[PDB]
Nucleic acid binder design. Structure first.
Lengths: 75, 94, 91
RNA sequence: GUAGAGAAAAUGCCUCGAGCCAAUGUUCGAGUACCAGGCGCUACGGCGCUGAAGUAACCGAUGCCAUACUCCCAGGAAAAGCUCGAACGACCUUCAACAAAAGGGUACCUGUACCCGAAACCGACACAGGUAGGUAGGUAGAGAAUACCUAGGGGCGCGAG
RNA sequence: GUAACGCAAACAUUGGUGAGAAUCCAAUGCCCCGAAAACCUAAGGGUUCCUCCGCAAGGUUCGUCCACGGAGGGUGAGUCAGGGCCUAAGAUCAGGCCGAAAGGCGUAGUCGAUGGACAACAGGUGAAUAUUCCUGUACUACCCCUUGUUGGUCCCGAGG
RNA sequence: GAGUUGAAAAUAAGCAGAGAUCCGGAGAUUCCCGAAUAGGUCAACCUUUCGAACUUCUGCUGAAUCCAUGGGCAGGCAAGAGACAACCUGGCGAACUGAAACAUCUUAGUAGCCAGAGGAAAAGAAAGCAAAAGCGAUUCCCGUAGUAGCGGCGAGCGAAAUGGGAGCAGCCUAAACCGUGAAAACGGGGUUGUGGGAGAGGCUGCUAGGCGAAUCAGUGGAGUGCGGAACCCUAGAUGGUGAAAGUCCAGUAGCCGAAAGCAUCACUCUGACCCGAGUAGCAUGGGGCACGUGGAAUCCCGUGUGAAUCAGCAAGGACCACCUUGCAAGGCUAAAUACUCCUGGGUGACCGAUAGCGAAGUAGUACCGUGAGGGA
């Protein structure tokens, strides 16, 4: 599923247009990733699927601050 | 006869009702069939009696246990356990 | 835990009354009955033995095509089915 | 039987009335029947009594031996039942679990009718059609072809000129 | 009131039944099939099976007859077949992965015979069932008791 | 309150004034399949050890690592699951067609599928309208108006404010501060616009019922109609009855009635500090607002950047200045509004068996189709 569990971001609809306006539909996906994060208390790896902006939010406000807004934790 | 039935069997107490119920649904149900009992000796009201008799019996066990508690889940379970342990035997008049 | 399916005290509907059954009473020393469709051999033999106080060498059962189970109930050489069935109104 | 982490498989020891593997065959099963034919029924169907001989020779299968033998390459299912067995890990354990012996005693569910090389399935039809498998008699013949027949089954549901 | 009446194996007679018979039953001939047009099964039908009655409709004619209509009956299993055992192709799939939703992949398992594993034969009987009922003679699986051994049982490692 | 034991109606035996049959409210039972749920399955069966399977609740435990998570065993009336005509919310999303062809555009965010929930749902209490005059959350009708506009400026698409109505209702929460370490996790203090904060000084109705006026004859199957003579009316609504009745019947106007259950009323400021942040804005790619990127505002989105805090921030159709208006990035909320598988009451210049629902007869039946499905 193309959903970041933290930001709640989805893919977006887009009628991506030619020079002549002969449209289609396609999805502008989210810039997700499988990546390890570093928990403060535990001090372990956490193998998660996040957005790029999720990283920015985690580096802003420490994991547990962010992770309360998506109920599930302790893997 | 009808209005009497509560005054009859609300006095008889549960373990009395077992053998009462069974004896009722035993003979005067089963024995009255067989050849439809002597061919001119049905008295077909007897089927009307016993069917309505046992149904009045089973209410008293049930309607008593509501006051205690139970609530139809346990009731069905103990109906299986009770029903599991029976053993048919000759009815009265045989 | 006894019965495949629990059914009843009841089970036995009625004995079959016809010309084949009467002859089978004399020949095989055996009764003939209509029972529950969900009636077992074991169940029938426990019922009829425990009812009349008679022994049962074997029971053999079939389902006539409407869906009502009829059972031949055979009796030991000791117990006499002619006189037994006489006192249940078949003779 | 033994070594070596090793109870099975595997590296070396010995020992085998030197023999095994089978289908048929001898007996009981079976002094019983079954039985060709005779002696009486009484009207549209079988049924009571009696009851002889019951062996040999040759031919012989696509059947069995045989999951046998030879040859070939394209190299020919799984899993439980079964038999060992030592572990470790659990349970059930001294009104008990596994082995053997005659005699006892005990015995779940469903299918079973009838058609099924078809007037009953499949083809709209009581349709010259289709439909998996089994059993395979005699004479002639290489033969499951053919021709004529047995057992068994039929004369094709408009007829007359 | 024409074409047709579904193969060119084939019928004939005597008697019977009955309101009525080329067509229904019986006998006698004759002829046809016989690696079938014979007798058993699997699938499928789904009561067509047997008995007594009826003949409006159905049956390419008739019809006293019927796979037709009405009424009543008929299918008996420890050993036959399946399931209560086993697995293949395939199916579904806990946790797991992936996907707007619906869902897709996929392991552990679980289903799934067309295969493995398992114990019965003859004679007899009867309108309609018979390895099922009867008679004889069998076999498989359990509970007794006589000897016993101290553990069994599952998992589990092998043979097969 | 008088005869009953369903429909077709026959028999047999029963139950009925000590009050059945019936009618209403509340309870009890409810085989098997089906969310199906002990396990399996070819729905209505088979196997069992007889069990709500699975998940969050709640009691213990104890993996690979301390804690923890997975997992295992328990108790559990045990919340959830499925179904449901239309209406409705959200997700995906056509094409034929129109443009006399056709790709922008139109069909349309329509049909369809998918998910969700209620009696309505959604919206909703101003970072809003509007213009120097003012208005005060939504939603629906009349209107403005086919006007302003947009548009291969083609086909077409098409607003809003002012104005008249229907109906009206407004709330709560986080931090700055406080206490029991500290963003261990809990209670109090406050939440507002032409700036605000804390801090320091039983009542009625419904679900059964009840009482309820007044006509007689002649008329040749039968009279309610015809000629005759009456009467009632707070009853001349209806349905029946051998032929059409205010007075034959059931009724109606009018009054009476509930054990039980459901609905309804019952003074200062350091201008300290606070003002919802990866947010707004910005670059770039889009969607949608009547508005096709156009001078393109407003609203929402992928990518990358990335503020400020009422000496503030946003809007007023690029944009800057000055005015005016409001306070975004947390939530909740009745009504007016939409609809009919359906219940009760009423009505019809509606149908009358080729009509009216497909269906006036045991019709989604017979029948056809492998199946979806069609269908007398």
């Amino acid at each position: 599923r193309r959903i970041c569990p933290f930001t709640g971001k989805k893919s977006n609809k887009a009628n991506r247009v030619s020079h002549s306006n002969h449209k289609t539909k396609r999805l502008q996906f989210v810039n997700l990733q499988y990546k390890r994060v570093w928990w403060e208390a535990g001090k372990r790896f956490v193998k998660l699927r996040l957005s790029t902006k999720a990283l920015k939010t985690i580096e802003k406000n420490g994991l547990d601050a962010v992770a309360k807004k998506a109920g599930i934790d302790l893997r | 006869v009808k209005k009497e039935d509560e005054l009859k069997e609300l006095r008889t107490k549960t373990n009395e009702q077992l053998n009462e119920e069974i004896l009722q649904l035993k003979g005067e149900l089963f024995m009255l069939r067989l050849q439809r009992s002597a061919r001119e000796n049905f008295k077909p009201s007897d089927f009307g009696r016993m069917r309505k008799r046992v149904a009045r019996m089973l209410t008293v066990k049930r309607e008593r246990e509501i006051e205690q508690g139970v609530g139809k889940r346990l009731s069905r379970k103990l109906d299986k356990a009770w029903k599991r342990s029976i053993v048919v035997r000759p009815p009265p008049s045989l | 835990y006894p019965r495949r399916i629990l059914d009843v005290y009841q089970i036995l509907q009625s004995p079959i009354i016809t010309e084949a059954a009467i002859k089978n009473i004399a020949d095989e020393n055996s009764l003939l009955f209509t029972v529950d469709v969900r009636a077992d051999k074991k169940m029938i033999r426990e019922a009829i033995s425990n009812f009349f106080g008679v022994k049962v060498r074997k029971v053999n059962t079939l389902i006539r095509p409407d869906g009502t189970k009829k059972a031949y109930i055979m009796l030991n050489k000791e117990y006499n089915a002619s006189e037994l069935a006489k006192k249940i109104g078949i003779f």
